[PDB]
Amino acid sequence: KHNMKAFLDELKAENIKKFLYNFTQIPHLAGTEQNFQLAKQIQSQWKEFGLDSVELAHYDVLLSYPNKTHPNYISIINEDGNEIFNTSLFEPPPPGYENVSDIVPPFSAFSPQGMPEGDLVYVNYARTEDFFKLERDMKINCSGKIVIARYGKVFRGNKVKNAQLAGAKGVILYSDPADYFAPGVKSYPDGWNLPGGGVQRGNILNLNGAGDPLTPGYPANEYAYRRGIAEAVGLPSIPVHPIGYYDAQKLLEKMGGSAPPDSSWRGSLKVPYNVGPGFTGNFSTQKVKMHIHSTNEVTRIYNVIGTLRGAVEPDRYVILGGHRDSWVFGGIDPQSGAAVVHEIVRSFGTLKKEGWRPRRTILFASWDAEEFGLLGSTEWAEENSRLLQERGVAYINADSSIEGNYTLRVDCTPLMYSLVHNLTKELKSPDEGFEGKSLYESWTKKSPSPEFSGMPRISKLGSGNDFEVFFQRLGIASGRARYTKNWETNKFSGYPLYHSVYETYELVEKFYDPMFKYHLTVAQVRGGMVFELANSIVLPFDCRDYAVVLRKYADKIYSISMKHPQEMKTYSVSFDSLFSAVKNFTEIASKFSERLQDFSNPIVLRMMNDQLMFLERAFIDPLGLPDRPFYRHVIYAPSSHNKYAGESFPGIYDALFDIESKVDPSKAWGEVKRQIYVAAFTVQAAAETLSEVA
Amino acid sequence: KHNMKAFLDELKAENIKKFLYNFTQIPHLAGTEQNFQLAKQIQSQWKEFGLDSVELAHYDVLLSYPNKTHPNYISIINEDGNEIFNTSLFEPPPPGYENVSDIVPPFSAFSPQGMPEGDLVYVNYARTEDFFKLERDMKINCSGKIVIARYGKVFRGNKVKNAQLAGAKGVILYSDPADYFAPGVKSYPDGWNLPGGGVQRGNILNLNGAGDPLTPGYPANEYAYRRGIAEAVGLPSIPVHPIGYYDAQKLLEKMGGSAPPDSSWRGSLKVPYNVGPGFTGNFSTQKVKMHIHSTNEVTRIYNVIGTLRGAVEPDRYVILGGHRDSWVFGGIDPQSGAAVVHEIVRSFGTLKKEGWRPRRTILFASWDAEEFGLLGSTEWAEENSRLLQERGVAYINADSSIEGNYTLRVDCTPLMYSLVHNLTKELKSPDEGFEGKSLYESWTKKSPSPEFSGMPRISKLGSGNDFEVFFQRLGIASGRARYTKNWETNKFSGYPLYHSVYETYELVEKFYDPMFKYHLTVAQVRGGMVFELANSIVLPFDCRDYAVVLRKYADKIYSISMKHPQEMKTYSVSFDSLFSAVKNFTEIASKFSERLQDFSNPIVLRMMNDQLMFLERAFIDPLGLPDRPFYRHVIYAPSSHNKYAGESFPGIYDALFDIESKVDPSKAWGEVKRQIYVAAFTVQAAAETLSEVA
Ligand SMILES: *[C@@H]1O[C@H](CO)[C@@H](O[C@@H]2O[C@H](CO)[C@@H](O[C@@H]3O[C@H](CO)[C@@H](O)[C@H](O[C@H]4O[C@H](CO)[C@@H](O)[C@H](O)[C@@H]4O)[C@@H]3O)[C@H](O)[C@H]2NC(C)=O)[C@H](O)[C@H]1NC(C)=O
Ligand SMILES: *[C@@H]1O[C@H](CO)[C@@H](O[C@@H]2O[C@H](CO)[C@@H](O[C@@H]3O[C@H](CO)[C@@H](O)[C@H](O[C@H]4O[C@H](CO)[C@@H](O)[C@H](O)[C@@H]4O)[C@@H]3O)[C@H](O)[C@H]2NC(C)=O)[C@H](O)[C@H]1NC(C)=O
Ligand SMILES: *[C@@H]1O[C@H](CO)[C@@H](O[C@@H]2O[C@H](CO)[C@@H](O)[C@H](O)[C@H]2NC(C)=O)[C@H](O)[C@H]1NC(C)=O
Ligand SMILES: *[C@@H]1O[C@H](CO)[C@@H](O[C@@H]2O[C@H](CO)[C@@H](O)[C@H](O)[C@H]2NC(C)=O)[C@H](O)[C@H]1NC(C)=O
Ligand SMILES: *[C@@H]1O[C@H](CO)[C@@H](O[C@@H]2O[C@H](CO)[C@@H](O)[C@H](O)[C@H]2NC(C)=O)[C@H](O)[C@H]1NC(C)=O
Ligand SMILES: *[C@@H]1O[C@H](CO)[C@@H](O[C@@H]2O[C@H](CO)[C@@H](O)[C@H](O)[C@H]2NC(C)=O)[C@H](O)[C@H]1NC(C)=O
């Protein structure tokens, strides 16, 4: 038989290991020849594996690279302008790679050029609440200062935006061992911790879903009209550079001015963590000087798009996609995910060669330039938006398969909760101590739902990965799953070697998953989801699960507003319409579910399949969210404070955020009311897509 | 048999006459009790006729009404402030209606209040080119003047916008006999001409597709958040009032200053048509004074929505809609169309009672508040946009069935050209001299295509009627057909009694269509179109017809640009991408057509039906046109100079318009290039929806 079990059993840990090794021997930086060569390799192999068609889709997008003959670095400069300390020009390469060429040195992609000199202010994680603390509570002024911030907690681009709006003239990002050195584990190469010379690369854009900075709304094809750099989307206005904790210690050790306001501001270095501004008495005349010379350059990128045509519904697309480009070797990010996709394609192709075809079309994607702001997935979705809007069933992401080895981590639309629960109950746990138990059982035990006993946690989708255009722009049901760590407060901070030269094949094979069993488990979850979506007669979505969360989000946003009872009285701020719509959705979804169970009629089936496919679509508002036109989903958006985090009822959330500080409360509460109306309306309209059609 | 002929033969001229009489005995002004009562009547009758469900959909929208105890009027005022001449407070009522209550006096709906006094400037039709002539050629300055303009040629709201931007402090609109009195015909009640006391009502908004001024993007339901009046969409900033030609003669006769620049500026009144400013020597100290006291008021409106559920594809909607509200009696506009819809519903209901159901669902609509800016259709489409976007096959409009008795007038998407040609070849001509000939034959003879011998003219869709939200916002294939006059240069000017108290049942029965044969012919065209759309196994759209027009529009826009060869050289302005996309569309459409002919498989059929349904959808750009977010179709939009006129490649057209006058040619030609890119991209993307799906 050619069923899900046949598919799943064909998947091999040994193959995932071979592919991971193959993808991580040299760097695959977006826009470089090495990454174009790997694209052509994957294209050839997917053809060999059996896909019907496999094409490269290329675009010319704005990328950013250091100047090879004019290196970026930071100094402490004394009174006469002598540079008395310089940060490192490169990370010491790991064992056996010390002769590898084309390792991009640490830099912040899309930083402008500059050589700002000034006094340091330490801003903790550079979160919105950290700047509130500095400015409002401590009366410390960042204007014209160079800010130094530790990585962690939120996307680095949010830190840079926050620093810019505080009036900073530069930002230094560093990795504190508090966040990137787990106690009792050794530094790379002898363990998975970050050494003091290690540095996290990464882009610092604030694109809000736009894709290539120069072509928002339209694919960056051969005839594209491009904005001028001054009108580009999302570029930072101040120089930015990342450093390791040996270098950070040198910049922080001399810091004076105010003490840290409390212990949540102190990392693990042997320094005071004084906020500044500037250095203590002896060194009061020394300054910090950045030297940034990176350039932004329009550069060709390449997505690989493979098609396995559906036997029955070829015009319905289930998409498995993840990126290929890496900062350096990409041993975890992304090749641990790319190797899983490769093995999934191989397994599906094995069935296809024996005469099987899925019910619906499956599209497989190897995206490029993800690290530079989700550019390859976004430009391709811009190009194909009409096809995706009317035909897209679901998008399953496939970046890093592991970021730890503790338990499963799933983020997805409520429409996929039931699918995930059911599939994980049928898969074996790879975990020690759970042998012969289901993955559902180990996951639920290790990651309990905060709301329901006997259920696992499933998180909301925000952004920071390639599902963003499909979910938040186009409203296609999306999901992701990976293995993760225990480390709760590190959720958005990355594993220690994230985006460093030390993230290698050996890191994975020695320290994360020597048997490739966690990789195989993730291949089973991702491939199992794709299989069910592409093959189930009735699409495997449960609208009632959306009803349950919508009530939870409505309770939560109302609870936020209810911290301001006098203003809700004054301005007549009612959530009644939103609860009404949520009640209606619950009622209608229950009735639709009964019909879906109670309905030989392919037109009624597909009618119902279309109602299921278009339900996520119905949460899209064509006018988008305020000042974020490419975030169009009304129930979820990336947090305006942290792109990695999903926020629910984002339009109402942002209207309420820090509202007590607004100068015109009438206007501010009027906008809360407007957002309640938009949310109630959209929930009701989505409900009505599930009513009988005529 | 229950085929199209059964449907068509059931339609009766006598029934259309009875319904027209029934709908035109009292005024049915939007927002009044009389119009709510007529809504309830139609709802009851459509239920009796056999529809499955018939509901009222109500909204609370901004309307505008004169003050009953403080009448609007215009004066000539002498030096001491004596009002020496006053315009009329009402139109003399026609025979037998002189005791009818609730006839709204002539006014310009949505005028602000004011009593501006000043010198007159005569601006011809107040078109963009008329203001260019005044300001650029004649050096006449309208700033702080009261402008007087003749109705005709363009939508009145465009005139008011043009006057406002010229700095006018008020606008007087009047009906010149040149445009509203056909030579050799008598004035109402003895003929169909406009008497000197007759006045054309009408709104003067510039909504650009927004719908209710207070709720753009969202339905004006019970919990809607409304903009404040100062942020409302489309309201004029200066007072405006309409008058008849007896009153106009009194205001124009004393005009001095400059002579009319040429004869195209002279109407038929026995006056010089001097442009002003102000009056000739003797009267130089007299001024014109307006008194406008109308108020804008949020008011409930009611659409009637009838459903005839499809037997096979209930989730595919074919919509026949037209408005019910009138300025006064609505003898032509809209009740000549509403009576036709009523008879169509009755005929379909007759088949339904004998056990027939159409293949797809047919929705019938009686829209409200059309006269106040397409408010009822727009608010309902805002409410139901998700259903319409994913399920809407086609929209057929049904306003005035006659505006003359000469020949057919059809405006529609190219996707319906073949359907119209085929249906009209099967219908009998009602025309004298064409007895026993097809409607196709009489129409093609009387209205020859400017491009093709042996073909009739079919015009583009702009706006000024209820199809606007469906076509230009949502991208649902739309069409309209009516009987019209010969009068070429009067195309956008209306028939003489348009929006006057004289537009009555008797006007129609005595002077337009005493046998109701033109009404019946239009009922056959509209009902025949709906029948084929709702019943044909393959949707009756021909994508190759879009390919042919896209080439014609590309040639036309290129020809406009090519008036500026030096700038196209300087700024490297190429149309190559747009012609490429049009060539690709032509190639792909030809291949799709072959498959549609060459393809027992309901999934392939519906796949293909979906490709046909979503083709118009593919011309929608979710970012909309520049500064007109609710005009989203890239191939067609309402002309920015005349809402009634369709413009092709509007984004490129508007970027080129008057470009030689722009201060920064680099920027202006850059925007032309941007619009060429958007157009090429959208044409290519629409083409790709017709490629094989996988
Ligand atoms: C959840 O679904 C329910 C349907 O089960 C839906 O109920 C609808 O609620 C609206 C708003 O309450 C109702 O609107 C009323 O409609 C009647 C006519 O049917 C009007 O007369 C009412 O207006 C009068 O009263 C108002 C309130 O006091 C006044 O403001 C107004 O000036 C009028 O005097 C009012 O418009 C509607 O009838 C029901 N529909 C039903 C029960 O079928 C509810 O809206 C849904 N929730 C959301 C958020 O959509
Ligand atoms: C109409 O449909 C045709 C398909 O039949 C489609 O043709 C495509 O045109 C694009 C643009 O010309 C081609 O793009 C080229 O792709 C190759 C790789 O396949 C690249 O190497 C090319 O780039 C080089 O040359 C450029 C031009 O001189 C340089 O600017 C660039 O720096 C590179 O040196 C170029 O991107 C594409 O291959 C074809 N596809 C085919 C034939 O399948 C055409 O685009 C459609 N029209 C529209 C408006 O979409
Ligand atoms: C990764 O695997 C690929 C595919 O097996 C290898 O590329 C092939 O290598 C042989 C030997 O050079 C060539 O003859 C083939 O043409 C290549 N096949 C392709 C590109 O499809 C590649 O060598 C491997 N890379 C590493 C670093 O092991
Ligand atoms: C930090 O690096 C800078 C730049 O390379 C060093 O300063 C330069 O030193 C050379 C050789 O002594 C001089 O000729 C240049 O004029 C200096 N350039 C600048 C920009 O100051 C500096 O010596 C380094 N500091 C340390 C502590 O190694
Ligand atoms: C998850 O599996 C459950 C248990 O099998 C499925 O729920 C059952 O579905 C069948 C088929 O419709 C019904 O007859 C049962 O009554 C359901 N049992 C329940 C609700 O406990 C559920 O559909 C699956 N979810 C998917 C496939 O998305
Ligand atoms: C238009 O026709 C309608 C429907 O025939 C008439 O309304 C009906 O009139 C009778 C007599 O008053 C009532 O008993 C019915 O209840 C009405 N039916 C409805 C409203 O569905 C109406 O009188 C006619 N109007 C004119 C001016 O002739």
Ligand SMILES: *[C@@H]1O[C@H](CO)[C@@H](O[C@@H]2O[C@H](CO)[C@@H](O)[C@H](O)[C@H]2NC(C)=O)[C@H](O)[C@H]1NC(C)=O
């Ligand atoms: C035009 O109408 C105005 C307003 O009704 C007339 O002026 C008024 O005349 C009455 C009675 O003579 C006076 O008491 C008011 O003071 C006047 N009002 C204003 C606003 O001036 C005027 O007589 C009319 N002109 C003509 C020619 O009939």
Ligand SMILES: *[C@@H]1O[C@H](CO)[C@@H](O[C@@H]2O[C@H](CO)[C@@H](O)[C@H](O)[C@H]2NC(C)=O)[C@H](O)[C@H]1NC(C)=O
């Ligand atoms: C208009 O009618 C023409 C003539 O019947 C239709 O074109 C024919 O369609 C049949 C059925 O596919 C083909 O076999 C013929 O070859 C076509 N004849 C032609 C192109 O001359 C056309 O489809 C009709 N248009 C509609 C229904 O939209």
Ligand SMILES: O=C(O)CC[C@H](CP(=O)(O)CCC(=O)O)C(=O)O
């Ligand atoms: O630009 C973006 O939105 C994200 C770019 C990348 C995505 P990533 O590949 O490293 C994976 C991060 C994640 O899945 O949360 C970054 O976080 O630096």
Ligand SMILES: O=C(O)CC[C@H](CP(=O)(O)CCC(=O)O)C(=O)O
């Ligand atoms: O506001 C609008 O866009 C049009 C309002 C009305 C539409 P109408 O019913 O009179 C018919 C005009 C037409 O079909 O062109 C008007 O032209 O005054």
Ligand SMILES: *[C@@H]1O[C@H](CO)[C@@H](O)[C@H](O)[C@H]1NC(C)=O
């Ligand atoms: C790299 O180094 C220097 C900086 O001025 C110069 O030779 C060259 O222009 C730079 N390359 C760039 C800016 O891409």
Ligand SMILES: *[C@@H]1O[C@H](CO)[C@@H](O)[C@H](O)[C@H]1NC(C)=O
């Ligand atoms: C912060 O510092 C700069 C000093 O030039 C000043 O312009 C700005 O107003 C200051 N802000 C506050 C709130 O003190």
Ligand SMILES: *[C@@H]1O[C@H](CO)[C@@H](O)[C@H](O)[C@H]1NC(C)=O
């Ligand atoms: C993998 O699992 C073991 C068991 O707890 C643990 O000791 C090790 O630290 C884990 N590896 C990583 C990288 O978390």
Ligand SMILES: *[C@@H]1O[C@H](CO)[C@@H](O)[C@H](O)[C@H]1NC(C)=O
């Ligand atoms: C109508 O007439 C006068 C104008 O001031 C006044 O009595 C009343 O307020 C007006 N009604 C309105 C403004 O609706």
Ligand SMILES: *[C@@H]1O[C@H](CO)[C@@H](O)[C@H](O)[C@H]1NC(C)=O
């Ligand atoms: C038109 O007239 C007014 C007179 O106050 C003036 O402000 C404006 O600049 C004039 N425009 C031109 C172009 O003469």
Ligand SMILES: *[C@@H]1O[C@H](CO)[C@@H](O)[C@H](O)[C@H]1NC(C)=O
């Ligand atoms: C109707 O048709 C006849 C024939 O030409 C014509 O005399 C009459 O003017 C027409 N009616 C209208 C209102 O155009």
Ligand SMILES: [Ca+2]
């Ligand atoms: Ca783009």
Ligand SMILES: [Ca+2]
């Ligand atoms: Ca609205």
Ligand SMILES: [Cl-]
């Ligand atoms: Cl992922």
Ligand SMILES: [Cl-]
């Ligand atoms: Cl019409």
Ligand SMILES: [Zn+2]
């Ligand atoms: Zn990644």
Ligand SMILES: [Zn+2]
């Ligand atoms: Zn990454």
